[PDB]
Design a protein around this ligand. Structure first.
Ligand SMILES: [Zn+2]
Lengths: 47, 83, 286, 83, 83, 83, 83, 83, 83, 83, 83, 83, 47
């Protein structure tokens, strides 16, 4: 239809969002999940 | 100019009808094989369903490329400007 | 106003670009927006995509700045479910150590789902609200950003750039060119492999360029068809008849019920295909 | 004017006929495997029926778009307005 | 006026002919699988018949729409009134 | 009259030809499965024959409508009276 | 009258050719299944042949109607008299 | 007679081409099953060949009718005599 | 003169193309099962080969008539003499 | 220019519709076998998926060329420049 | 003259496109069974290859005739001199 | 001149669309059988892939000729220089 | 006619859709999330 300069701002926002998710969202949640799994596994070693 | 408009209507009809035919036949085949696989062993139904959705993405791609172009020909018209 | 004028108004975007005198102004007609060259912006597409991305990132950060590592609350339980689902989807296709793939997949999925979701609201609410707030009676305003091919193309071009970047990074430039000129049709005797370089280049280049195009156009076609059918049903209410405004309600309900499933499926397809295309940028599949 | 009207009548016929053909063939293909699975595993019928309806939702996706566009062409006309 | 009515006749023919072709092929497939299931599992035929009718209901929808629209075209031509 | 009468012959030919093509293919599939079932267990033939006739009714339902419409167009003509 | 005759020639060609195509494909399917069944159960060949001849009657009915109508259009002509 | 003669060549082409297409596909379908049966049971070939010829006659009947009609339309012309 | 020759070019294209399409699909179908039988019973290939040639003789019968008629039209056009 | 532009819409419609039909049927056939392979060997799913995506590039290669040339015809025109 | 030349490009397009479609489908059908046989018995692959080539010659026989006639039509058109 | 150019555009669309349809269906069949073979015998995958590419060359032979001739018809025109 | 009738039709359809989604889609999602929370709590108690 009308290919515009909107094609560029969309990719810039895409990269900004992906980098902020990679640095400030994914690591804390993954660390919390892995620490809870470690806690559960440790309690299974009571034997 | 009436010839251009009538032939654009025919082009839209072809563009949507051919996709409607192909998508229906392809999804009939895929769904039949999916049902056969589910009947063989119902323990793997979720995995098979995920793979079926993944395959359904590649099967309807160009039928959806043509539907957008048909709806772009119905309301906009790149051929009228060309005279 | 007429039905044709009603439909034609809903299909135009709020453009900002170079007017005949000055690079500061909004086009007031569709032709005035077409006259603007490549250097114009759809303000309604960007203002919705950025807003929804910021909202999603803020909500997900609220459940990551205070992760409990113990009993989770309501919000971070949902966030952990989404993260776990994305991680499981990534691990079943990608076997490498790349730390970019999984947050990228999560962002793509949630952002696209949020962009498609606003199609469910009635098609006349937001444009009329914008017209009333601004004070105009002819303001162009389209809310669904994924019905704009610019948004889908911008989403897919960055994925294509990541594919090329990681392919070069992991295979070298020589490996990148070899996976385009030697791999599809190959043999041992040199005299034949030189006669197969153009065929391999043609096939691999077509398949490489067809990925962003298909990724953008599938989503664009699905969302554009959904919004167009939503607009067409609203014309049945414009007649003002009783027996026609009652069938229109049933059609609208059925279409919305189907469209929510279509909206979820499109985001899922985009995420899974991005994961698959990035995973095959890392190993020799042949 | 008459050419546009005739070629939109033919466009409506194409849009509905191709969709009908595709839908009938695809549903024959899907129901054949559904019945084969129901005869092979008579206890899985309730699950197979739900999966068949899920797949049928994908089968009748572009066909309904074409049918709606054909009714829009019969009772309105974006092409006549273009002269 | 001749062209509009002449093309309407062809539109009607395309509609119901494509519907008939599609329904015949689809019902051939569905009934063939039904007969196979009935021969293999003669005790389950009363259930298979009901499931086959449930599938036949889905198989005939768009074709019945097309037949109705074809009759509407033949006896109540909506295109003559559009000049 | 010339154009309408000329295109009515094409309409009738399309009707009956598409009906014949679809009916022949569908009956080939159905009869092939009937023969396979009869060969697998020879003592089930009387039930399979009745089930095949029941399916054949559905298979030939629409083609009969097409043939009737074609004969109505051949011997009477609504399009001629529509001018 | 030249166009009417020229279009009735095409009508006859369609009416016979589509029937021939459908009959050939349907009989190929039916004969393949009959050969498979005859190889499976040699002692049931006399019954299978009669049952195949039963199906062949349903397969060719509309094709024979089309052939008769085509011969009627070739050696007589209801359209020449503007019916 | 210019348009009648020109449209008769297309009629002959349609008759013969559709007959050839159908006959080739049908004979491929039949021959595949004949070869499969011969390979599984080499002793049954003499009976299977006779049954294949019996099926082939029915397969080729209508195609030969169409070819005869096409030759009649080529070396004579029942339509030119009708002006 | 011009219409007759232009239409006979399309007639020749149809005659050859439809036959080529049909024979390609038919030979694919036949050869696939020939290869399957050869793989299943390696010692029986010299008999399956002569049987495949016997079937191929029937498969290509009408296509050769079609191509002969097409070349006769191309070089010794019989319709140019009849106007 | 009117006929040249009006016949380019039909060209684009054919280029995109035939490719859409072909890709939908081909991907249905491919995905149906991929699902069965994933059912038979649940531990081989990733290898089957990567091989299927290797095949998909060959499957959709020509269709994407058709889509590219169709888009080249819709917004540029090598034919209008030839008057 | 323009009609004859214009209708010769359609003839070439048909002659090559129909042949390409048939050849692609037939070679897919043949290669599938070739791969199945190679998977079943990997020691017979050298014989399966030569048998497949023998079949492929028959499969591609008529398509080469069509593609030669199309290139004979493109350069040194035979129908131009006739008029 | 204009009719020649429009018919050339339609011919190009026909060539590329038919080639795309054929290659897509053929590759769907071939790849499905390749995936079946790979699922059965994961040790033979590297040899099966080589054989699949050998078959794919034959599958895409003619279609490449068609697309090359279509490009030749778009960027040159042997028909315009013949008028 | 037109405006002020399309708005009413859209509002009616939207309200029906919202009721449908609040009575048939929301409860299963809430139930699944609460089941996840309960299982996590049980695991932590066991540990
Ligand atoms: Zn490689």
């Amino acid at each position: 239809m009308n290919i515009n300069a909107t094609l560029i701002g969309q990719s810039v926002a895409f990269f900004i969002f992906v980098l902020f998710c990679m640095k400030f969202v994914w690591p804390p949640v993954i660390a919390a999940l892995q620490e809870r799994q470690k806690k559960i596994a440790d309690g299974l070693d009571a034997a | 100019m009436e010839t251009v408009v009538g032939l654009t209507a025919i082009a839209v009809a072809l563009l949507i009808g051919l996709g409607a035919l192909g998508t229906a036949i392809g999804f009939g085949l895929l769904g039949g094989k999916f049902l056969e696989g589910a009947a063989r062993q119902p323990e793997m139904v979720p995995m098979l369903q995920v793979k079926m959705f993944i395959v359904a993405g590649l099967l309807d791609a160009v039928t959806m490329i043509g539907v957008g172009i048909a709806l772009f020909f119905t309301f906009a018209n790149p051929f009228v400007g060309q005279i | 106003e007429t039905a044709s004028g009603y439909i034609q108004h809903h299909l135009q975007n709020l453009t900002f670009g170079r007017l005949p005198n000055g690079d500061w102004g909004f086009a007031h007609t569709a032709e005035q927006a077409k006259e603007m060259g490549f250097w114009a912006f759809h303000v309604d597409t960007l203002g919705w995509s950025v807003l929804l991305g910021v909202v999603f990132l803020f909500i997900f950060r609220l459940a990551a700045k205070k992760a409990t590592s113990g009993q989770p609350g309501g919000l971070q339980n949902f966030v952990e479910v989404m993260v776990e689902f994305v991680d499981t989807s990534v691990k079943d296709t990608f076997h490498g150590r790349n730390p970019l793939i999984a947050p990228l997949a999560l962002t793509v999925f949630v952002w696209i789902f949020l962009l498609n979701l606003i199609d469910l609201v009635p098609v006349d609410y937001l444009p009329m609200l914008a017209a009333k707030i601004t004070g105009d009676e002819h303001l162009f305003f389209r809310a669904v950003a994924t019905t704009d091919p610019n948004a889908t193309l911008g989403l897919s071009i960055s994925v294509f750039a990541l594919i090329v970047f990681y392919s070069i990074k992991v295979k070298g430039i020589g490996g990148f060119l070899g996976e385009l000129t030697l791999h599809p049709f190959s043999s041992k005797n040199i005299v034949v492999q030189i006669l197969l370089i153009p065929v391999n280049f043609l096939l691999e280049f077509v398949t490489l360029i067809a990925k962003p195009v298909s990724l953008a156009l599938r989503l664009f076609g699905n969302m554009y068809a959904g919004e167009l059918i939503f607009i067409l049903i609203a014309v049945m209410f414009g007649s003002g008849m009783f027996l026609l405004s009652a069938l229109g309600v049933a059609l609208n309900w059925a279409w919305a019920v189907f469209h929510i499933l279509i909206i979820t499926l499109q985001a899922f397809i985009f995420m899974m295909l991005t994961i698959v295309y990035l995973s095959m940028a890392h190993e020799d599949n042949h």
